[model samples]
Target: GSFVEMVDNLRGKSGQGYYVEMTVGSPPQTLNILVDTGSSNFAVGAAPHPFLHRYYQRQLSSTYRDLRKGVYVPYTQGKWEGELGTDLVSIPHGPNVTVRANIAAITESDKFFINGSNWEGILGLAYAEIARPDDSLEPFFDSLVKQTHVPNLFSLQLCGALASVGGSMIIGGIDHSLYTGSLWYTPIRREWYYEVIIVRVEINGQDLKMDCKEYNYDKSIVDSGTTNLRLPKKVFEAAVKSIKAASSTEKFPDGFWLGEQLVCWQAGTTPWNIFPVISLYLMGEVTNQSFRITILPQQYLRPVEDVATSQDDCYKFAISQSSTGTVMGAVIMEGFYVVFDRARKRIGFAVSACHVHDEFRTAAVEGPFVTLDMEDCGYN
Candidate 1:
């Protein structure tokens, strides 16, 4: 019986955040990789580089290792440095489950920046096309699916206020607490990347049309690691307008800051009784009862100074105000069963029992799909 076995190991500074560390390559040069389910690409810190600190320099003996390749990852706002190659790594959970994977030997002088204060490097488990054929680093779960007989479904529960609260990424299993009454699943899409087509968007009773001229069918990523939604600038501005109008405000800057802002509006005061509501319609789903996403109130937002702004007069706003792209973070993902079916191209969302819609009862109600056809004004 060749079933894909799961090896679970926790790594991170105590009390800050813990990550699942998977082993890649062989001993002496074994890569202790932090498995990241949120992102789709995979790479590690490459070898023979700068910025080499003692904390990141765990040496392995030559008897069990071989390093022969290099890799590089570039970001829109950041740079990544590393060498890519294959290695035989061992999982310590049970009988040293060894596997072959693409390894990124992080050198000491590398200039890559970790988004958080804690944590060293990341090993992406999300599905992605590798730069080279030999560079393929199979997702721990995907390997299991190929090697074993269990179902191909895996679920993650990012419980607690901060990820440091010991969030668990359950493989080959599902968390019953995240669902409401039953699981509503959709067929997977057929593509290299896991993407979903948003048929419509409605905010405060205003149906924002999906302009084919502006929006590409495959422009979205279902990132679980991200805590906030990032939408295209144009879509973000439109959403902000609805939020401001619902809260009875005139204007606010569109940018990211570290604090919150408080905006108040009379309940049922608008002409259409357009109570604040935010809804995202997937391909097939029509009502919030299926997706059950959350809508934050203006009061939860706080304004802060934008760090990217060089001048002191630069404006800042709450987390809700800043819009990069349409992001579905944990706050909005609550009570929803979001499934990233990579082998299949589409992502699925359904109401889960763990979702408490009552918490959002007084906020707003998201209706079914509404159509709108606005001109492409160059946003996103």
Candidate 2:
């Protein structure tokens, strides 16, 4: 379980996206692909970019195998199709840290498929069951568990800022240094994605009923690949109601909107103070315990400036109003250091310092960005 390595990504990668340097094949074809918790498929080679930019060259590797199966992957943007194969994959520490996994060598893809996105492909970190459309292969992490010196545990420290040295993805072990307080654990409600049950949702001390007009309140996905925090239309209505009701302190004249959504906020106000504190109470299946992550108004109320009108507004919004599962994307995640312990089937969370000042390799060696002795952080 001591296998640990931190893969670094570029800072200005279009959508503030984080990526990993995964070397595949015999001699190691190193490729920079988006590190995503949203899906489970290591796909590359196909992008709008040329073959030399970042695409994988299968013809040069001796350890490559043609699975003869063509696969198509779909996302919130567009789609990509490609041929599948098996190859030796490595997560950049040394030559010994490698494993064989099935990968999709994509041949066709979209320009906006990832983060705006600018990367050649995506490296899905979720289990096989979570891959949308199909799941008939061994995921990259599972293969590492079965083949390398690593266990089934990995942590992602995503790049939260626009112009900073990117984040790190630690495989095999958890970095206790990057977080403060105890590592709060929560169990996966479903096999697909990091599905956690929000036993109760509260805003300003008021409990939100489990009311659903579109989707079930059984589970939600904590995906790093996604940008906005998404909820069902009906569920978001309740959120707006609470925000509006609580805004008796200082209410804006009109909500901000682009086209479909509504309500914009004044940029000068303290968002967290104006908005109610929303807390999500989660239960642990393995430990059979409970914990809570409190989100402030500053955590949700984000700033945005309109280029067309030279107007500035806070993106006080319901990012996505879908009719499926709850998507806790980058907005909520920026506040915590999350560890996906897949082997034990539990995820850990703690408040993040939100900034680090070290090179990726050194950060991994000296341990994570920061660490603090937590007080009274017992089981909830």
Candidate 3:
């Protein structure tokens, strides 16, 4: 059986996230859709908008049907609401099985579409528990898995070496060649999201020393749609303090950390070594056992532009303050090969092959670190 399905050449900028072309409707209408693990409704551009170049002309597809249902989703930045329906869908680079699937035809939206974006739709890969409107709506990945009869697992590889450099998404199975080491898995804390527990946090190998509960006060999720590594306000403050203390000799403007300003340096004069390595200890199969995933400055100190108008290299901080607990987003995700192994109710991470550059690798996964006395840090 050809169970290995692939959606290769996932293209888009980092903040905008990556998208793969999906053939939807009858006679196959191709649309660039964002592969999001954050939400659970497969929505496409159905109406005319200033930012979008084109939309799915549902009337042209003989296989399309109007389910006469309403669906709405609210993102932290924007919102959209529209009619729900079912249509023939298939990934050209993936499985040969084409399934009739639920599709949210978005007719209205706010700031969802940014100018000059390559993607026009969103494909939710998470569980149906958080599906918009109700749980009756099955996610795209679920349908794909059922039709293909493959393992209930998928993997994502984001080669974010540059802003627009593309990567790949493997459905139904994991590609061992995409990653370097063995997969380290953490049990999913919640089905609504690919939620996992963080037992501890480290900066340059030194613990933040805060209560483990602080790491997941609200809910920590691995969201590919989110652009940055977002930390709770308390955790964010502690991380910033530690980063500054580790590099006391240098003075970084407050605006940089606030995402209000960018830091730049002359060509070939970047200061990546001064930043501290960031690590998160995730809960293991056992209650007290944990594992650590670390990222170097090359992963956190995001390179913006090599020469922007001036002959200087610019960078932006990849970590940000979040009111909604922690989000291990693309910045950290770019450094590792992530697997959404729903069948096992767990997520896996390993060093991504594309992440290594200049003979230096920025990502690392290690330890079955058993904290015998640590309390159950999962959400109550």
Candidate 4:
């Protein structure tokens, strides 16, 4: 049994997402693939585009097999249609055994490939349940686990919340050094999208205490592809109101909370101290129990520039309102070492190494808070 270690690379487009290096095909052409947990298909840039630097040419690989299947996938911002095929894919930092894995060579896309981006592909780490075409085709992780006897678990640590040092992705095993204290696990409510249950949210210790269902409006999923913490509109409004109320002195613009505009404060003056710590209460693995994960302002009030002008430091809101679902993206995950423990049907969270270094200890895990009977807290 072996655990794979893939060093994540963040190319720094507003500190978007992280990618890992993988070698695909027989003669092993290396391509950086974005490590996305939101989707299941491992798609690469096969056709040339103005923004992308390279493409996965099928002719170069000796063992490439075109399945002649059409694959189409959509995202919040982009969509792609491509040809499905199988290739001998191996991660440079993965297990020694090269497994024959499904690869979707993207022929065309709309707004998926960004200008000056580092990654050329995406390695979806979720499950076959959301795999394109059908669930009959196994995801890359499933094939990796089936071929090699590694544990059916993977952990992610996104260190580049502030600086672009990138991060790490531990496949098949959890790295103990990356996290501290005992890992508190929450039951995975669904197999697709790593869906989990969120019971309540608090600004500081005071709970919002709204209809708990608003927290998980459509569903709450841990998505690495998304850049910000997306809250259901109602919950987002509550959070924005609470945070503004907490700092009543500052008359912030409407666009600031909506994430449409950036605001700047004079040099040597920052707004982090004025913002309150936000906590999310999640349904625990045990019956009638819950756990709280808290994030300091450092996790949310993202800095745009140390000094936007000669005398101002600009910052943007990392938390935004979502029309449908709550997304716990990089803004939240960067604070904690997140474990996608699919084998146990649970997701674990612990204070991360990067977070611990923050002067204020940016992320915290507290209590198996005895929760009341909130049976309908999750979205069906």
Model number with the top lDDT: 3
Candidate 2 runs further than 4 Å off: 1-16, 47-52, 93-96, 111-118, 162-165, 211-218, 252-272, 285-289, 305-318, 355-380
Q: After aligning candidate 1 to the native by TM-score, how far in Å is the CA of 333 from where it should be? A: 3.8
Model 3 lowest lDDT segment of ten: 1-10
lDDT of 1 by residue, 1-380 (tens): 12123322344432223355544533433343444445544455545333322123325533224355544556455656555445554444322345554445554332353434344556555664533223255554455556555356555433322123334444544555544444444333333234444545666546666463233222544555544555666666666666667756344333332224323324323222233656655544332222323343321231122334343322223223223334455444433555555444445454533333333343222333333332122233
Error of 3 at 355 (Å): 0.7
The Cα error of candidate 4 at residue 226, in Å, is: 0.7
Off by over 4 Å in 3: 1-7, 306-310, 356-361, 373-375
Over 1-380, each residue of candidate 4 has an lDDT whose tens digit, in order, gives 22434544233445546888888997998888888988888999998787777779889999999898888888777899999999999877765678889999999999898777777999888888889988988899999999888789988888764355477788777877788787899988888788888898999778998889889989899998887899999999888889988877778889988888888877668756678888998899778899999988777877784443445677889999898689998888888989999899999999887773346546888777899865689766
The top-ranked prediction according to TM-score is 3
Native-referenced Cα lDDT, model 1: 0.43
State the TM-score for model 4: 0.94
Instruction: Point out the worst 10-residue segment of candidate 1 by lDDT.
Output: 297-306
**C-alpha displacement of 179 in model 1, angstroms?**
2.4
Q: What is the lDDT of residue 161 in candidate 4?
A: 42
Q: Order candidates by TM-score, high to low.
A: 3, 4, 2, 1
Backbone clashes in model 3, listed as residue pairs: none
Cα lDDT of all candidates, in order?
Answer: 0.43, 0.63, 0.84, 0.83
**Per-residue error at 227 for model 1, in Å?**
3.6
Candidate 2 lDDT over residue span 68-174, tens digit each: 88887766668788898898887664225767788888888765344334456678888888653467788877787888667678876664652333665667676
Q: Which residue pairs come into collision in candidate 2?
A: 114-117, 177-370, 255-263, 255-264, 256-263, 256-264, 272-297, 272-298
C-alpha TM-score for every candidate: 0.64, 0.80, 0.95, 0.94
